[PDB]
Amino acid sequence: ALKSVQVFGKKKTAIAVCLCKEGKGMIRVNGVPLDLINPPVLRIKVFEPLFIVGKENYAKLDLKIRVTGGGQVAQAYAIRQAIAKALIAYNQKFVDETTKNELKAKFLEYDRTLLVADPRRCEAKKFGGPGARAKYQKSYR
Amino acid sequence: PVIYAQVTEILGRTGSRGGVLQVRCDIMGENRQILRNVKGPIRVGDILTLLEAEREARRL
Amino acid sequence: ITITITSTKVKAVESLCAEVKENGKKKGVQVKGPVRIPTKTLRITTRKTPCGEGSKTWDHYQMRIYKRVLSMKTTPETVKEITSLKVEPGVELEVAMF
Amino acid sequence: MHHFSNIKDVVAIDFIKAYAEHLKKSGKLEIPEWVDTVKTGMCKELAPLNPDWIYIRAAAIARKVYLNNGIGVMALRRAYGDQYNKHYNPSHRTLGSGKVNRYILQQLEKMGIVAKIQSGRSLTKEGRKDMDKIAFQVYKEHEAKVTPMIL
Amino acid sequence: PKLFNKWSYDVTVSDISLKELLAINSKLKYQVFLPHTAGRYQIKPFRKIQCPIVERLVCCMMQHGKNSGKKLLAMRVVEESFEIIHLLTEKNPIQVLVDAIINASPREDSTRRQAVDVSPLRRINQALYLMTMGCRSAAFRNSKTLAECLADEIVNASKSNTASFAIKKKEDMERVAKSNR
Amino acid sequence: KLNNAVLFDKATLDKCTKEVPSMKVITPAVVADRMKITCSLAKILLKDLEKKELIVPVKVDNHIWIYTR
Amino acid sequence: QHMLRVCNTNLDGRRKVPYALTGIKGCGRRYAYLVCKRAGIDVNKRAGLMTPAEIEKIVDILNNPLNYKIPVWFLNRQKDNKDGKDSQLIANAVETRLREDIEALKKMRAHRGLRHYWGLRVRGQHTKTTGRRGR
RNA sequence: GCCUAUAAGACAGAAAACUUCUUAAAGGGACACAUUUCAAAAGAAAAAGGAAGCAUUCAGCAAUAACAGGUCUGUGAUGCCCUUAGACAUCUUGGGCCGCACGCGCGCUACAAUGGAGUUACUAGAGAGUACCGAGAUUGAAAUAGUUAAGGAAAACUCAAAAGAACGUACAUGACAGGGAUAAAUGAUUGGAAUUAUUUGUUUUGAACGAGGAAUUCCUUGUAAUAUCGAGUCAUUAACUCGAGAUGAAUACGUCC
């Protein structure tokens, strides 16, 4: 029993691995609830997909999410991807794809990145400069 | 008393370096063509605001 | 037994990684899968010039170390007998008895 | 929704707040002679302003041993550390005060809240049990005062 | 959705030169729960229009060096500024920000001088930038908090008030360009 | 240049309590400027007048205090 | 009383007690907080609100630290010469002890004392570029 | 085994099953092909799809010819010239390269309330480690540091995040609690030796600096900027350099002034 679908979200370095299965809408992120996330400014940030398509879809799903890198804001965005990916996977393996299509279309009609990871990464430092493009000050005389 | 105009086409950039664009605009009030010097990013679709429409900015 | 192989050439260990695995079919029945331990780049940065003149330029040398681990039960006396096989230069073979 | 399974179901700061009076009412945490004559470590320049800073700190340390089984004074010194910016050089992290942090751990052993395992200090049955009911008191207070985000 | 679960997006723009260039309610993505969107609005020309109007104000509150890369703090000031602005005008702060932009935006510029008209996108860019200067300068070495200091700037520039820092600049260059014809 | 005093007197307390609630937006940043007293004192009166209910809070946290009539 | 007076040093009464005791040239901030706890006087109180019946304790508590439970490593003058091993430096005595000490090296013509006379950097620093006061 | 719940599970000790994440191999995968427009053509722009559409991005290698550019103070690579037993060869003791009337270049910290100070929970990436190297755990101490000491030649063990955030009827526009210079007592580590303070701890001392003239540098996207981490030097010593991640602007899609 307890049919499950495994997804993950990605960011700069944050990896938000989730585990969606039958439940009662009890979301736990590394043992803490989703309502008690560390950056309280971004609490409504991770709860948009719940309100995007109605929490009734997630009302019977128990997600077990884990974050293994990044920053306090990279993980915030990585959670949102894992929440949206979990719903799509559940309505794909078991539920009819047409029902998942409307949810997928709704997800991409508001935020495309909710299901595709941003490819941007930190550029390598170069010699003769303090960063990736900046250069040390030039003195002529 | 400010009368807006619709940008129709871009003639080019002038003003020493490129910071001023010559565009031919029409006033939607009477479909009157006007040429003005525009400072800033502009493209064909958007419109422009002209507080004064008595001058022709053909720049000799 | 546990076979640990490490070398600077990826294809040198990889070719020998499957050489022991294939050899395990004789004088034995099974050899465990190859475990690919993460590589260890050895980055050394130096100034190009031999003096202080010129612009500030550097060259980024690096060498990679590839680690593969194998497991196998067999017998200590007849694990591979010779256990030399004329291994190619630059590769190292270490066997962890028992 | 919301449920209680462990102390990780409430905010960290208020549980440590509500755990200070439990050490205050018990009275088994004695007050040494250097409570007001020391700071919490290296980077600080002032002693803590709160007169009961030990009680909140002791409860905070009691939460750390609850999440980590084998923990030490050195691993707690870095947890209770700051940045050393007393000069023109850029600041770098420094360790906390071992004495003011190991003293609390030793006293917590006498109360039975932690034990002395081979790999540091770990909780006991009474230690594990004691903080759960208080974590519910803040939980019941929290749910009665705040509206859940889901609902 | 609402900006902070408090402010709706039932806002209207008077002029036609800025209705399409202000991201308010035309597309669903403009209505966002937080002004923290990690998109790429600076990879193609005329891509910054897709950024929310409140979003473009948040970034301007991240300047003067020591505040670089602090968007969570800048969001807090903006979030607390709209509550003050809502009380001061009993209207929607999103509406209050939009109409103040039109009044504070200069309509003419002089280039080396030669008076020329200003594109609508540059009008928006200078509109946020002009009011941001006033909030930054007035809150410097002052008791008034940044949120309240920004709060009084928008409402003053909302109608016509000359007490606004941005309003003084808009009439300053339009008067200089009057001498640069 | 301000010298807005730190201790209270009968003069302001007999005039500050009739005009502060009549204001629409009350906060220490904006209230300390008008009755010529320190903004630290503005913390005391906002909570003291809360007991009298003469002023009702609308935004109170650890950063700023916003009150209304 | 807006302007307090204690150990011949006047402290502003518009600040808290710990932050007005910093006016004394022998007492800083860590010392100021300690005497507030030692004397049993609230730190959150203002200096200009405190009764004179206890101010005489503060001047006493500064000139007599040993009897009032003060650690010996908290003293601004440890191992004093010419007998005595207690600070007694919480006064205008900070300058009095400072001047005659430099003259002690100058009398004995030590290198540190010699550098003091010339007004140079005493603690061995690079004087080529920094410290460019006009002369 | 333990503990809280009203009902989910949490934690501690092994036990054994898979590979979504992890690691690392092999192939696959964007060639602008596919549409519209613009230019019998090479080609250009929008939008769509897509992990990825500027040569996808950042780097490496990098043509012919030349400088009388730097290095003979890296070389047991080297010609000529010079010194060549009172030596410009070699060793030891001490000092100097740190010396200050001043001028210039690279940087770090500040001038604060987009903040400092007192607490609380935090989330990384990439380096290095032998017999004595990286050093865990137990202790006394207020700290620097002292005494005994596991495991670890290492995806094994050590090695650890702050900017930011949350907490308070604190600070309140005050060269103040911003700033930490210069000094005075004292405590230890490294060193055969610390005086001209090697480095650092406690207390006190509380200087200029209120955003900076003419000039002038770097920079177009996870880039600038902001704060930090590892390594080279290292008995001990970063405000340096080489790398690494953490938040994430504005302004251009232009012209030869």
End-to-end Cα, chain A, rounded Å: 78
* Residues 6+ away with beta carbon under 8 Å from D5: none
Which residues 82-141 in chain A show a CB within 8 A of chain C? 127-128
Three-state secondary-structure class, residue C77: coil
Three-state secondary-structure class, residue A17: strand
Resolution (A): 3.1
- Token couple for D46: 């002032």
Residue numbers in E near B41 (CB within 8 A): 45-46, 119, 121-122
Cα dihedral G59, G65, G69, G70 in deg (nearest 10):
110
Burial class (CB in 10 A: 0-12, 13-18, 19+), A114: buried
What's the CA–C1' distance between E161 and H254, in Å?
37
Burial class (CB in 10 A: 0-12, 13-18, 19+), E176: middle
What's the CA–C1' distance between E136 and H213, in Å?
25
Question: How was this model experimentally determined?
Answer: cryo-EM
The C-alpha angle with vertex F52 and arms to F49 and F57, in degrees rounded to 5, equals 55
**DSSP string for residues in A43-96:** HHHHTHHHHHS-HHHHTTEEEEEEE-SS-TTHHHHHHHHHHHHHHHHHHHHTS-
| Alpha-carbon Rg for chain C in angstroms | 19
Buried b (16+ CB within 10 A) or exposed e, G40-66: ebeeeebbbebeeeebeebbebbbebe
Long-range contacts of D84-87 (CB under 8 A, 24+ apart): D84/D42, D84/D43, D85/D43, D86/D43
G48 touches chain F (CB under 8 A): yes
- Using the CA of D15, give the nucleotide whose C1' is nearest: H120
Place of tokens 């990684």: C17
Q: Which amino acid is at F23?
A: M
Q: Distance (Å) from the C-alpha of residue A39 to the closest C-alpha of chain E? A: 10
Q: Which amino acid is at E75?
A: M
Within 10 A of G23 (CB to CB), how many other CB atoms are there? Answer: 17
Within 10 A of G89 (CB to CB), how many other CB atoms are there? Answer: 22
User: What is the arrangement of strands in the sheet containing A4-10, beginning at the earlier edge strand?
Assistant: A4-10, A15-22, A61-67, A28-29, A32-33
Percentages helix, strand, coil for chain D, rounded to the nearest 5?
50, 10, 40
Please count the residues of chain E.
Answer: 181
**Probe site for chain A from C43, C44, C49, C56 (most A CB atoms < 10 A):** C56
Within 10 A of D122 (CB to CB), how many other CB atoms are there? Answer: 18
What gap in Å lies between CA E49 and CA E21, rounded to an integer?
6
| Other chains touching E, judged by 3 or more CB pairs under 8 Å | A, B, F
H or E element, residue E117: strand E114-118
Residue E80 DSSP code:
H
F6 touches chain G (CB under 8 A): yes
The number of C-alpha atoms within 13 Å of F68 and in the hemisphere containing its C-beta is 9
State whether the Cα torsion G66-G68-G73-G78 is positive or negative: negative
**DSSP string for residues in C23-64:** HTTSSSS--PPPEEEPP----EEEESSSSS-S---EEEE---
- Token couple for G27: 């007492």
List residues bridging with D96 in a β-sheet.
D41
- Token couple for C44: 């050394």
* Residues 6+ away with beta carbon under 8 Å from F6: F38, F40, F41, G14, G46, G48
| Other chains touching G, judged by 3 or more CB pairs under 8 Å | D, F
E107 touches chain B (CB under 8 A): yes
Residue of G nearest to D49 (CA): G43
- Using the CA of D46, give the nucleotide whose C1' is nearest: H118
**Probe site for chain A from E2, E33, E80 (most A CB atoms < 10 A):** E33
Place of tokens 């340390």: D61
What gap in Å lies between CA D31 and CA D54, rounded to an integer?
9
G14 touches chain F (CB under 8 A): yes
Q: Are E7 and E24 in contact (CB under 8 A)?
A: no
